Design a protein around this ligand. Structure first.
Ligand SMILES: CCCCCCCCO[C@@H]1O[C@H](CO)[C@H](O)C[C@H]1O[C@@H]1O[C@@H](C)[C@@H](O)[C@@H](O)[C@@H]1O
Ligand SMILES: CCCCCCCCO[C@@H]1O[C@H](CO)[C@H](O)C[C@H]1O[C@@H]1O[C@@H](C)[C@@H](O)[C@@H](O)[C@@H]1O
Ligand SMILES: O=c1ccn([C@@H]2O[C@H](COP(=O)(O)OP(=O)(O)O)[C@@H](O)[C@H]2O)c(=O)[nH]1
Ligand SMILES: O=c1ccn([C@@H]2O[C@H](COP(=O)(O)OP(=O)(O)O)[C@@H](O)[C@H]2O)c(=O)[nH]1
Ligand SMILES: [Mn+2]
Ligand SMILES: [Mn+2]
Lengths: 288, 288
């Protein structure tokens, strides 16, 4: 459930937060619109686990595995079992053009997997883009009835460390690991005014990933509907944004501020970017 | 409105938040349950004003002025006009045993004041305590129909600087200015197990003020109902908590974590505590 009467927390013994001691002094931990930026050291997971378990929270995780990308599902799902929302109710939704190629992965108690067959698209860009349509179509359908939050991620990834209820909020995006230290003029936003995804050089907060976003079912339905509609306008006008649905997601999150932002801990590429000191954990990472 | 469809923000030009530059390195700006702690430098008020104006947010401000405390209303209200939620819709609710002693204060456009007559209590403790009952009785009544958020404050105070929509959230408390640097064993929580307000020496996050709390109408109704019920139990058992409704508020906020915490900028006593470097603004202050 979300927004329902909240029962009292039980007594808990944990370290006192000290007002004159920051958790992290090396990084921005709150956005200028007062959304937490989620880094290791900023959250007590025992408190958060209590809060979300008392609400019997169910998290849906969507992943697309179209054409050759079905090869990524075994590691994705097996590592999700080790690291993603462990202890909470989880519903995996695997969208694929090859239901028979979905590996048989053993799940923990309270976790389920549904295979949703979709059409395969010829262009990888179109495959990547059509996720917005498909997610919004399934929101109306089963997601509103089955889960409280949706987490929407790329499949060519593995979980290496904890990804849990600290991410959950009405609307979240994730800082792209290539751009978290960049100035906004360097962000690869869509820069052509002819596209609905257009962001001028003097606007922008962050560069968010197409590969890891989420929120409440309602807010995810809103985001994916808006991005799908904006993509349809661009298509009608004969323009395709530079980074496809990621460009539209960035436009959306500029105009509709997320209520949490996830640090690049939550989507990293160690081969391309190593392991910087500012990253205390690499939680979800690109497969080589 | 709260929770209603949110329109897009317009284009805005403002400084880019930089991930590798904290806003404040001298203070904790987020709690371990991922609630912002509101300090100067943590928020862009232009972004927040946009967000809340697009929702046509109405803020109710409750204040009790019983017996001699009616003398405090003129400065309280006149300074509120200069500093509290300017630009937003505001409804003041003045609870008093002397309606004729309420000063005639000129209000800005979009702001209104209602005088609510109540009984006067003999003991200042009882006057202070009975606010919980009265606020919960008025929630059911007019507050649900008239405002989106409630802010509940002491009257023996003046606004000196901006107090605005940065505070608004489902549930907030304010760090008591005497204890923000203290360890929890030193907090003046109720320590007798015989009281419903009891907090053991190894529990507690912060010491919050009875004099400045708020949230959505629903969450404020919940808090004030719970504190009133707990006070009635204590009375039936012949015990009165050490700091009266403040002790109960602390118990409530321990077991029901606030979604923002306000720094001591938001309730300070300059005569008793001076003007420390960590306080960049003194926003709402005790009258000598
Ligand atoms: C300049 C150095 C930054 C390197 C990061 C570039 O990553 C790419 O960013 C694009 C937006 O400009 C777009 O989001 C694709 C993204 O590349 C993907 O993600 C990376 C983190 C790597 O995993 C890469 O192999 C993958 O194609
Ligand atoms: C130890 C030094 C800290 C001094 C602060 C004490 O303030 C009092 O705290 C009590 C809880 O222990 C209770 O909340 C009343 C509070 O006193 C009130 O608030 C202060 C900030 C002053 O304005 C004081 O005059 C007022 O009575
Ligand atoms: O042929 C494809 C191309 C893309 N995808 C899905 O679309 C996501 C985004 O594409 P990709 O990971 O190739 O993009 P990048 O990580 O380079 O942004 C992939 O993770 C898959 O989930 C897919 O299933 N099959
Ligand atoms: O005779 C009284 C005593 C208390 N109060 C109200 O109760 C609040 C809390 O009491 P006080 O400010 O005396 O307590 P302190 O600031 O010492 O906690 C006051 O601000 C008033 O709003 C009042 O109106 N009349
Ligand atoms: Mn990918
Ligand atoms: Mn007072």
């Amino acid at each position: 459930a979300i927004g329902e009467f909240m029962v009292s927390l039980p007594r808990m013994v944990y370290p006192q937060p000290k007002v004159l001691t920051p958790c992290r002094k090396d990084v921005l931990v709150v956005t200028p619109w007062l959304a937490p930026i989620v880094w290791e050291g900023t959250f007590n997971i025992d408190i958060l686990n209590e809060q979300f378990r008392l609400q019997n929270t169910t998290i849906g995780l969507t992943v697309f595995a179209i054409k050759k990308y079905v090869a990524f599902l075994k590691l994705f799902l097996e590592t999700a079992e080790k690291h993603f929302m462990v202890g909470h109710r989880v519903h995996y939704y695997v969208f694929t053009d090859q239901p028979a190629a979905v590996p048989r992965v053993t799940l923990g108690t309270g976790r389920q997997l549904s295979v949703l067959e979709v059409r395969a698209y010829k262009r990888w860009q179109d495959v990547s883009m059509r996720r917005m349509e498909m997610i919004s179509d399934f929101c109306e359908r089963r997601f509103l009835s089955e889960v409280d939050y949706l987490v929407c991620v790329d499949v060519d990834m593995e979980f290496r460390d904890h990804v849990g209820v600290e991410i959950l909020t009405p609307l979240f995006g994730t800082l792209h690991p290539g751009f978290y230290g960049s100035s906004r003029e360097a962000f690869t936003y869509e820069r052509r005014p002819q596209s609905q995804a257009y962001i001028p050089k003097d606007e922008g907060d962050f560069y968010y990933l197409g590969g890891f976003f989420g929120g409440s079912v309602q807010e995810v339905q809103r985001l994916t509907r808006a991005c799908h509609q904006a993509m349809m306008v661009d298509q009608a006008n004969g323009i395709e944004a530079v980074w496809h649905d990621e460009s539209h997601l960035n436009k959306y999150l500029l105009r509709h501020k997320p209520t949490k932002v996830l640090s690049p801990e939550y989507l990293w590429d160690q081969q391309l970017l190593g392991w910087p000191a500012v990253l205390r954990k690499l939680r979800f990472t690109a497969v080589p």
